[PDB]
Amino acid sequence: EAIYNRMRAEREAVARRHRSQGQEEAEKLRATADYEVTRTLAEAERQGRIMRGEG
Amino acid sequence: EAIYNRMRAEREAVARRHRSQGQEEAEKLRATADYEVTRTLAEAERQGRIMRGEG
Amino acid sequence: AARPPEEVKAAFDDAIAARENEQQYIREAEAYTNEVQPRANGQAQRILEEARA
């Protein structure tokens, strides 16, 4: 039983590593997407401010 | 019955010792992991603070 | 065979189970660390991206 548990745990370690790598990559992609969204919104707001200033 | 209780208590003593040692080692590992996580977050926060200062 | 009496068989096999449970706890702690660290890396990246934004 101890040997079976050891083998099962050492396989679950690899499974956990794969899942964690996937989740970390997903989080990085989400972060950069949010940064791009904020950049576009800020640029549009700046143009709007310039236009209101002209008015 | 007294002899049986003495045997049983003597066995639970060893069981408790083993479990306590395992739990202590697990707690030490969790503590060092938390320290590493805090260090990485602090480094990221410092880099973000520098970038905010530049902006 | 030199088995102990039935009344202490539970105590003996519980001692065996505790000996296994020690290594089980250690492995669980290692798995916890290996899970937590990548999440910290992702949060660090998100913090840096928020600062840049």
CB-based contact B41 C52, cutoff 8 Å: no
d(CA A18, CA A23) in angstroms, rounded, equals: 9
Give all chains having 3 or more CB-to-CB distances under 8 Å with chain A: C
For this entry, resolution in Å reads 3.3
Buried b / exposed e along B21-36 (16+ C-beta atoms within 10 A):
ebeebbeebbeebeee
C45, C47, C48, C50: best mutation site toward chain A, by most A Cβ within 10 Å? C45
d(CA B52, CA B45) in angstroms, rounded, equals: 10
Structure tokens at A39: 């950049």
Method underlying the structure: cryo-EM
Cα C15–Cα C20–Cα C25 angle in degrees, nearest 5? 120
Does residue C32 sit at the A interface (CB-CB below 8 Å)? no
